[PDB]
Amino acid sequence: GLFGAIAGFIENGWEGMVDGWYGFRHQNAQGTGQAADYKSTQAAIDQITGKLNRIIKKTNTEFESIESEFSEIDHQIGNVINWTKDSITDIWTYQAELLVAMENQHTIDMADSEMLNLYERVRKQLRQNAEEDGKGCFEIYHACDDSCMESIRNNTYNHSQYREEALLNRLN
Amino acid sequence: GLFGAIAGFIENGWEGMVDGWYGFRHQNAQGTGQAADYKSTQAAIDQITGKLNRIIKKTNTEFESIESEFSEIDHQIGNVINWTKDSITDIWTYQAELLVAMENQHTIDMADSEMLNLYERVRKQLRQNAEEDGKGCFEIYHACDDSCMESIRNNTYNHSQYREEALLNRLN
Amino acid sequence: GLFGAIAGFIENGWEGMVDGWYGFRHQNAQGTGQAADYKSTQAAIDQITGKLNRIIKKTNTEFESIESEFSEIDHQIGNVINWTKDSITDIWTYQAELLVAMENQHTIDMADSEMLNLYERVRKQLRQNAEEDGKGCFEIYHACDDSCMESIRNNTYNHSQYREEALLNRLN
Amino acid sequence: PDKICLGHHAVANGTIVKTLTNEQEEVTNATETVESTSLNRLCMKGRNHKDLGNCHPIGMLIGTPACDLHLTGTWDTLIERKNAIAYCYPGATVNEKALRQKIMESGGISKINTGFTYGSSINSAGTTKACMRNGGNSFYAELKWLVSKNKGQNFPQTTNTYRNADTAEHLIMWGIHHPSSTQEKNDLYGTQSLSISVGSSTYKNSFVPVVGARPQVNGLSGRIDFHWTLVQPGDKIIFSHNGGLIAPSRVSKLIGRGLGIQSEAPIDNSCESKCFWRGGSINTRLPFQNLSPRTVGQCPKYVNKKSLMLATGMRNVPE
Amino acid sequence: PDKICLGHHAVANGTIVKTLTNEQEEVTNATETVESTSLNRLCMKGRNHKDLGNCHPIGMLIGTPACDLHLTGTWDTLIERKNAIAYCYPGATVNEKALRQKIMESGGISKINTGFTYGSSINSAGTTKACMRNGGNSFYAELKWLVSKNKGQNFPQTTNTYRNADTAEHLIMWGIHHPSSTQEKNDLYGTQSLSISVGSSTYKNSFVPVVGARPQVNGLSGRIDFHWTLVQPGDKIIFSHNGGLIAPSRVSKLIGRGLGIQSEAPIDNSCESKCFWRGGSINTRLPFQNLSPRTVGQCPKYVNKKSLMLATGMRNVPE
Amino acid sequence: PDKICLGHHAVANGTIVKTLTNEQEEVTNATETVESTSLNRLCMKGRNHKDLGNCHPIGMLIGTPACDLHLTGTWDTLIERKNAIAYCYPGATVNEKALRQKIMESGGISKINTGFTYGSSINSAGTTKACMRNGGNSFYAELKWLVSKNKGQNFPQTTNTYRNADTAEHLIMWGIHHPSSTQEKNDLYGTQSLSISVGSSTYKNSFVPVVGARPQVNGLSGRIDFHWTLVQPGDKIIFSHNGGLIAPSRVSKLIGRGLGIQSEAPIDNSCESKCFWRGGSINTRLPFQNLSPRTVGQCPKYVNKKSLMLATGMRNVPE
Ligand SMILES: *[C@@H]1O[C@H](CO)[C@@H](O)[C@H](O)[C@H]1NC(C)=O
Numbered sequence A, B, C: 001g002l003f004g005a006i007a008g009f010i011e012n013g014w015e016g017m018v019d020g021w022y023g024f025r026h027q028n029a030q031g032t033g034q035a036a037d038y039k040s041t042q043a044a045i046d047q048i049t050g051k052l053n054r055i056i057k058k059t060n061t062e063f064e065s066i067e068s069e070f071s072e073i074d075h076q077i078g079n080v081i082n083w084t085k086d087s088i089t090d091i092w093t094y095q096a097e098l099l100v101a102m103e104n105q106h107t108i109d110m111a112d113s114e115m116l117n118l119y120e121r122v123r124k125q126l127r128q129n130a131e132e133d134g135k136g137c138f139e140i141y142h143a144c145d146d147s148c149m150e151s152i153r154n155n156t157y158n159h160s161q162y163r164e165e166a167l168l169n170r171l172n
Numbered sequence D, E, F: 001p002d003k004i005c006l007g008h009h010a011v012a013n014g015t016i017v018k019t020l021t022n023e024q025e026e027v028t029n030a031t032e033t034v035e036s037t038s039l040n041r042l043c044m045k046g047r048n049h050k051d052l053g054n055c056h057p058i059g060m061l062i063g064t065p066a067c068d069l070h071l072t073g074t075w076d077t078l079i080e081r082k083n084a085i086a087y088c089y090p091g092a093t094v095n096e097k098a099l100r101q102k103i104m105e106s107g108g109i110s111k112i113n114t115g116f117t118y119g120s121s122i123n124s125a126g127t128t129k130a131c132m133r134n135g136g137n138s139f140y141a142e143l144k145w146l147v148s149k150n151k152g153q154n155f156p157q158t159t160n161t162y163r164n165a166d167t168a169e170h171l172i173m174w175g176i177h178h179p180s181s182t183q184e185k186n187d188l189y190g191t192q193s194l195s196i197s198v199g200s201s202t203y204k205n206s207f208v209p210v211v212g213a214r215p216q217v218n219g220l221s222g223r224i225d226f227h228w229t230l231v232q233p234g235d236k237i238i239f240s241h242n243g244g245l246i247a248p249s250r251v252s253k254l255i256g257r258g259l260g261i262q263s264e265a266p267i268d269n270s271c272e273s274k275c276f277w278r279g280g281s282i283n284t285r286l287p288f289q290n291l292s293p294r295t296v297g298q299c300p301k302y303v304n305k306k307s308l309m310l311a312t313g314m315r316n317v318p319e
């Protein structure tokens, strides 16, 4: 896709993650865990809600009848009405088809961009203490306990604390 | 947003930058400074100018009156005219709303992409001589005076000139 | 452009790449190489084909004549027909212009994204064994023979096999 | 080393949607934009409405037997039905489509007496088996079939004048009797040359009864054709006639505006709706519908599509 | 160091397209969305069609000489040509536009005999130099110019009745003769007052021949005006007349539906198409066309644009 | 380490716009796409215009006194005003809407004499109090009220012919007088039954003056109803009458094309415009407008919107 994460470098989704749209899975000495990210999930939901509020809506124009259900119309005017209504129906069918196709494309790519933005945020936090594996994970070159993992998810991880240890392990 | 820079990893804009849309702030031993980037600024402006040239126009189709302002219109044909004109008005109202909504989404995301492209250009220029702080700045691990800062802005910075000094400071 | 690669950090296209849309050139001790990338090429082609399948199409609606080619139409209804037809023509002319302008913008940007996604896939494969030159190339800091180059193109390159050699050469 | 992995959710059963580039794109969730279901019921909650039943709108103005409960009233929504009876005695209204639309656009009918009276040589109480009321021969309630008191004699030269004393325009209707045979014509109106002229400030016309052979409709070959005009405030309309006029005893006043509905569905006062069609009501929040191109009120737009699914989620990439 | 470079293709000669932000964007390839070319022929492959030539659709119902080979038929496509002939004797049809469109919407015409017979006082074989057939005076094939057998004598009071025994509605036509001079009126119908009455269950009307000075059309100041109605299944229509009726010997039944085309382009049975206009056929898969806003069939939408190129490749960045 | 920071501009107070996902999106700058303001004048610079004032277009053809300055001329733009006068003597024109439209699509009017003459027993100079000119009783300038010179005497049978000797179609109008009483009818035309007939190669009709009681309009119970047709190049149109014809002394030729405007706004010869409506001129470069769905010329499209702001900058993220 456009931003290369969803159905891209991230191989697949997680069916187990029912408490959010995007999140973290980790592995440290204490074990493994899963945690959704609220800000990215909310950013995607809010944008989709915005679309629904604009799209799930009808005009306030009041129309009245120009075609008699229980009686014959005039021949000349009846052909004009049929031509006009079919022309209008072709326009609305086309516009609806384009609307939904265009919106679906943007929704899919928007969701992709939020996955990437979370990935980039984490990359930039970890600085020189981790490396990308190419599958959406970061291999962290120092011990990172449940507090340390929490700080990465919380956006309060300070790289300079672990830098000397990380660089020694990275350079070997 | 889509590209993660404007209202993303860059915390906010600079009200003090009045000579361009995107630019640089630096800090070295000599002091601080500010300069706009011409190419990224002009790229964004040119694209918006293109949108305006396309959108700010009317059709050259000549229409004549089918409704009398000052006298009666026939009952049957009059109802058809009101139905048709209101149907045409709903189409144009809907099309105007969608055009501007779609274009505004693209304008915002385009501007975001130009910020990111400038950031990416600088990142690749600096190579192994700098690290990203996560807020849109590059911490440069060598003495970079006004001429050096100018070379980064001019796209004439040669990383290999400072590489040895920077790897000493980055990796010890 | 929107993803910064095509007409961006990649200076120009390759007229000599006739077997695909995206690909690799390389240089090692053994020789100079060139090869198309099938996955990215096909991803772009499939998406363009999908657009063509949607766009190159008509409505199934069958329209009959409401204007006589050879005799006079009625005066009032003739004016209504002319107004309505010209109104419909203005809508379709507008919809056609918008559609193609929008689709063309997306096609160009989608193609840009597939180029960047290939670049990023290679960046993440090479890990700490290569550095970006800023022009779309990766300088590889170990001997990478034809089999090694194939492994990169095949997405089976293992960075840890060459890491020692690469880090010693990178740090000098 | 330790590891932190980034990812996105997925579901077991994803939904297919169409994009600009892909006809079969699987996403985590989607929602319909084209309404397919209709409520087989005229939802009339919050509307002062009038179900006409077997009464035809035009029958309200002339007073057909089926329309006796609908001769006056007020409403914001008027409901017409299939095979509604306008004419008991065979005939038709000139400019009928326009008149029906004016009634279905209105929000009520009021009736005003013409004050038309007739000399003793005229019988103004002509009736027919076609227009039955209370098990006996009758006529259109707002009109009078004027015939000669004595069979065969010349119907007298008569003038009747309605003045609109009101501030709003009034709708006046009258009929012209076209006899089946010369025998019937002479028995009712005499052997004289028949002529009927109608004249106001904004309207002028003349009519002649026409004898001619025709097939029988509900037993009868004769015809009563109706004509109508609008009498402006303060204007008068003068009828001059010597046989053949079916004269109004009252005129109508159309009041305000209302929504005209043509449908076969039954009324329901337990639900409110802003969109109606032949089959019933459309209570959807969705922007489009595929039930019918013929709708009235505040409606979603008609499209030639079974379904258009809007994506409300990312690409579904299951495990 | 060794190196691997990423890149994309380019072409020597790119194509210019328009985007949201740029009027002059070079891409590697593009394709046209607006059809600019037409085939100068009517593509009739897989179509059972009728080219009317110099026969006008109304002439098919009344039987003008030019339409003798087009009095009956079935077709899915009916083609009308410029300057087609409807009337040999001077005149016109009332509600001509509605009638022509009904014929051009049909998928064929069948003819059914009225079975009208006339007494020995009526000469039903009136003819004119205006309606030539094989170098001899003739008349509309589907009607009969009824006149008095004895020159100057009064045309008798006649009744003719047509009953529709079919399950479908039948279109019936008749003419009214309006003589040029009083001496001609008297010769054909007599000195009596002339009157034509026509009545069914769904239609009625009355007509009076009018003598009056007019200019000559095809040498004649007289006129025959045509009238028409639909006789419903089971119903009957009655003609009562005493001089001046041009009576139908047959009625028409329109069958099914077909596509009416008005065009000057020649038939081509080797070409197939769904879309037609005055200048020929539009055989394209493209969504839009700039040939004409007046088309019939299943067509691309008309747009006021010479070209609209859709990009089918990336930005072209040559070396 | 030293540092270089990348950033973008911002403004103290941004503008709110709508996007696909956000109704309250703040950007650095934006511009309006829906025009809200009109010029309250008819911008007539570079146009040969005629402001009709209180002259109705149909009055130009019949020559109502209000139209004496507008009986002939040329123009590319014709301006009609509210409450313009067509009829001084009470009455109406049959097919008036089509006629008004034809005049309002024209680029000028020329007048050609019919040449009709009348015998010594006809008074062709009938005038009326209702049609004042030069402070005296008069009549429609392009017509003649024909009556018997001696009161009570039968109006003589008369036939007049206008031949179109031009190469383009001419438009001919005439009136039929419908008297208020039998006494009036007898005084003007005599006791004979009255009949008017009109015949060309392309048109035929007959008319009968209707005597009937009517309310007074401008103090007159009589009525003059107008009829019209096009006379093709080279054709004759023949009038046969014996009382009741209001005869043409001239016919009209509509010349070329022009833009018809119905407006309440005054003329300004110093500004140009291509788009006009009731309230004046629209000289916007914007694609949409919310002034009126009724416009003429080359106009922005009407939308039901107060404002639609188009972003001309990035997201505003202030300090
Ligand atoms: C790359 O893939 C091709 C095709 O499967 C294969 O022939 C080749 O051996 C592969 N090269 C390496 C180095 O894995």
Ligand SMILES: *[C@@H]1O[C@H](CO)[C@@H](O)[C@H](O)[C@H]1NC(C)=O
Binding pocket: C052, E029, E030, E031, E312
């Ligand atoms: C350009 O695009 C069209 C439509 O997709 C295609 O048929 C044509 O072969 C393409 N041209 C090239 C050179 O690939």
Ligand SMILES: *[C@@H]1O[C@H](CO)[C@@H](O)[C@H](O)[C@H]1NC(C)=O
Binding pocket: F029, F030, F312
């Ligand atoms: C918006 O841009 C236009 C054109 O550059 C300019 O005239 C206007 O001052 C700008 N608006 C603001 C608030 O600066």
